[PDB]
Amino acid sequence: VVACFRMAPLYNLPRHRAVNLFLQGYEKSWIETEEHYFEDKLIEDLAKPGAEPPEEDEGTKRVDPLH
Amino acid sequence: DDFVAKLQDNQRFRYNEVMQALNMSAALTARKTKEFRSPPQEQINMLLNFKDDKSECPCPEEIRDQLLDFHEDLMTHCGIE
Protein backbone atom coordinates (compact mmCIF):
# COMPACT_ATOMS: atom_id res chain seq x y z
CA VAL A 1 0.00 0.00 0.00
CA VAL A 2 3.04 2.22 0.50
CA ALA A 3 3.70 1.89 -3.24
CA CYS A 4 0.33 3.54 -3.89
CA PHE A 5 0.99 6.04 -1.09
CA ARG A 6 4.31 7.26 -2.50
CA MET A 7 2.84 7.88 -5.96
CA ALA A 8 2.73 11.63 -6.37
CA PRO A 9 -0.58 13.51 -6.22
CA LEU A 10 -1.04 16.35 -8.69
CA TYR A 11 0.61 18.91 -6.41
CA ASN A 12 3.98 17.17 -6.72
CA LEU A 13 3.75 17.00 -10.51
CA PRO A 14 5.44 19.77 -12.54
CA ARG A 15 3.22 22.62 -13.65
CA HIS A 16 3.24 21.85 -17.37
CA ARG A 17 2.40 18.15 -16.98
CA ALA A 18 -0.54 19.00 -14.71
CA VAL A 19 -1.63 21.64 -17.23
CA ASN A 20 -1.60 19.06 -20.03
CA LEU A 21 -3.60 16.64 -17.89
CA PHE A 22 -6.09 19.40 -17.06
CA LEU A 23 -6.43 20.30 -20.74
CA GLN A 24 -7.26 16.69 -21.60
CA GLY A 25 -9.64 16.23 -18.67
CA TYR A 26 -11.36 19.54 -19.38
CA GLU A 27 -11.77 18.48 -23.00
CA LYS A 28 -13.51 15.17 -22.25
CA SER A 29 -15.46 16.38 -19.21
CA TRP A 30 -16.76 19.73 -20.51
CA ILE A 31 -16.06 20.38 -24.19
CA GLU A 32 -17.42 17.06 -25.44
CA THR A 33 -20.40 17.06 -23.07
CA GLU A 34 -21.43 20.60 -24.00
CA GLU A 35 -24.15 20.41 -26.64
CA HIS A 36 -26.22 22.92 -28.60
CA TYR A 37 -29.11 22.20 -30.98
CA PHE A 38 -28.63 23.91 -34.35
CA GLU A 39 -29.62 21.36 -37.01
CA ASP A 40 -33.26 22.45 -37.21
CA LYS A 41 -32.15 26.03 -37.88
CA LEU A 42 -29.33 25.13 -40.27
CA ILE A 43 -31.40 22.81 -42.47
CA GLU A 44 -34.13 25.45 -42.49
CA ASP A 45 -31.86 28.30 -43.57
CA LEU A 46 -30.34 26.05 -46.24
CA ALA A 47 -33.78 24.93 -47.41
CA LYS A 48 -35.04 28.50 -47.70
CA PRO A 49 -35.21 29.62 -51.36
CA GLY A 50 -33.22 32.80 -51.08
CA ALA A 51 -34.86 35.73 -52.85
CA GLU A 52 -34.89 33.94 -56.22
CA PRO A 53 -37.56 36.34 -57.61
CA PRO A 54 -35.86 39.38 -55.97
CA GLU A 55 -32.49 38.87 -57.67
CA GLU A 56 -32.44 38.41 -61.44
CA ASP A 57 -33.39 34.81 -62.13
CA GLU A 58 -35.86 35.17 -65.04
CA GLY A 59 -36.00 31.42 -65.50
CA THR A 60 -36.48 28.09 -63.78
CA LYS A 61 -36.30 28.15 -59.99
CA ARG A 62 -32.66 27.84 -58.94
CA VAL A 63 -31.74 24.92 -56.72
CA ASP A 64 -31.61 25.92 -53.06
CA PRO A 65 -28.38 25.48 -51.05
CA LEU A 66 -29.64 22.28 -49.44
CA HIS A 67 -30.49 20.92 -52.88
CA ASP B 1 -1.74 28.03 -15.85
CA ASP B 2 -3.24 29.59 -12.73
CA PHE B 3 -6.31 27.35 -12.47
CA VAL B 4 -4.10 24.26 -12.13
CA ALA B 5 -1.78 26.10 -9.73
CA LYS B 6 -4.64 26.87 -7.34
CA LEU B 7 -6.07 23.37 -7.79
CA GLN B 8 -2.68 21.84 -6.91
CA ASP B 9 -2.31 24.09 -3.86
CA ASN B 10 -5.77 23.06 -2.67
CA GLN B 11 -4.97 19.39 -3.21
CA ARG B 12 -1.82 19.82 -1.12
CA PHE B 13 -3.91 21.48 1.58
CA ARG B 14 -6.51 18.69 1.56
CA TYR B 15 -3.79 16.04 1.70
CA ASN B 16 -2.26 17.86 4.67
CA GLU B 17 -5.64 17.80 6.41
CA VAL B 18 -6.04 14.10 5.60
CA MET B 19 -2.63 13.34 7.09
CA GLN B 20 -3.39 15.38 10.22
CA ALA B 21 -6.78 13.64 10.58
CA LEU B 22 -5.45 10.12 9.93
CA ASN B 23 -4.88 9.66 13.68
CA MET B 24 -8.60 9.90 14.58
CA SER B 25 -10.13 7.46 12.05
CA ALA B 26 -7.90 4.95 10.25
CA ALA B 27 -10.79 3.14 8.55
CA LEU B 28 -12.03 6.43 7.08
CA THR B 29 -8.54 7.27 5.82
CA ALA B 30 -8.63 4.45 3.25
CA ARG B 31 -11.41 5.82 1.06
CA LYS B 32 -10.44 9.33 2.13
CA THR B 33 -7.01 9.00 0.47
CA LYS B 34 -8.03 6.73 -2.41
CA GLU B 35 -8.29 10.05 -4.26
CA PHE B 36 -4.58 10.75 -3.70
CA ARG B 37 -3.80 7.10 -4.52
CA SER B 38 -5.65 7.37 -7.85
CA PRO B 39 -3.72 7.97 -11.09
CA PRO B 40 -3.19 11.63 -12.06
CA GLN B 41 -5.55 11.44 -15.05
CA GLU B 42 -8.30 10.06 -12.80
CA GLN B 43 -7.47 12.81 -10.31
CA ILE B 44 -8.02 15.42 -13.02
CA ASN B 45 -11.27 13.72 -14.03
CA MET B 46 -12.67 13.58 -10.49
CA LEU B 47 -11.61 17.14 -9.63
CA LEU B 48 -13.17 18.45 -12.87
CA ASN B 49 -16.58 16.86 -12.16
CA PHE B 50 -18.42 19.85 -10.70
CA LYS B 51 -20.34 20.23 -13.95
CA ASP B 52 -24.01 19.45 -13.32
CA ASP B 53 -25.09 18.85 -9.71
CA LYS B 54 -23.62 15.40 -9.01
CA SER B 55 -20.95 17.24 -6.96
CA GLU B 56 -18.90 14.21 -5.88
CA CYS B 57 -15.78 16.29 -6.51
CA PRO B 58 -13.96 17.87 -3.53
CA CYS B 59 -13.48 21.11 -5.47
CA PRO B 60 -14.54 24.16 -3.42
CA GLU B 61 -17.03 26.72 -4.65
CA GLU B 62 -14.45 29.47 -5.17
CA ILE B 63 -12.34 27.31 -7.50
CA ARG B 64 -15.49 25.99 -9.19
CA ASP B 65 -16.71 29.50 -10.00
CA GLN B 66 -13.56 30.44 -11.91
CA LEU B 67 -13.89 27.49 -14.27
CA LEU B 68 -17.65 28.05 -14.59
CA ASP B 69 -16.89 31.65 -15.61
CA PHE B 70 -14.11 30.74 -18.05
CA HIS B 71 -16.36 28.14 -19.65
CA GLU B 72 -19.08 30.77 -20.15
CA ASP B 73 -16.54 33.18 -21.63
CA LEU B 74 -15.27 30.46 -23.97
CA MET B 75 -18.81 29.56 -25.02
CA THR B 76 -19.56 33.22 -25.75
CA HIS B 77 -16.36 33.46 -27.79
CA CYS B 78 -17.48 30.37 -29.71
CA GLY B 79 -20.88 32.02 -30.22
CA ILE B 80 -22.96 29.21 -28.70
CA GLU B 81 -25.63 31.40 -27.06
Swiss-Prot record, chain B:
Description of what induces expression: By TGFB1.
PTM per Swiss-Prot/TrEMBL: Channel activity is modulated by phosphorylation. Phosphorylation is increased in failing heart, leading to calcium leaks and increased cytoplasmic Ca(2+) levels.
Tissues where this protein is expressed: Detected in heart muscle (at protein level). Heart muscle, brain (cerebellum and hippocampus) and placenta.
Domain notes: The calcium release channel activity resides in the C-terminal region while the remaining part of the protein resides in the cytoplasm.
Assembly and interaction partners: Homotetramer. Can also form heterotetramers with RYR1 and RYR3. Interacts with FKBP1A and FKBP1B; these interactions may stabilize the channel in its closed state and prevent Ca(2+) leaks. Interacts with CALM and S100A1; these interactions regulate channel activity. Identified in a complex composed of RYR2, FKBP1B, PKA catalytic subunit, PRKAR2A, AKAP6, and the protein phosphatases PP2A and PP1. Interacts directly with FKBP1B, PKA, PP1 and PP2A. Interacts with SELENON. In cardiac muscles, identified in a complex, composed of FSD2, CMYA5 and RYR2.
Function: Cytosolic calcium-activated calcium channel that mediates the release of Ca(2+) from the sarcoplasmic reticulum into the cytosol and thereby plays a key role in triggering cardiac muscle contraction. Aberrant channel activation can lead to cardiac arrhythmia. In cardiac myocytes, calcium release is triggered by increased Ca(2+) cytosolic levels due to activation of the L-type calcium channel CACNA1C. The calcium channel activity is modulated by formation of heterotetramers with RYR3. Required for cellular calcium ion homeostasis. Required for embryonic heart development.
UniProt name for this protein: Ryanodine receptor 2
Species the sequence originates in: Homo sapiens
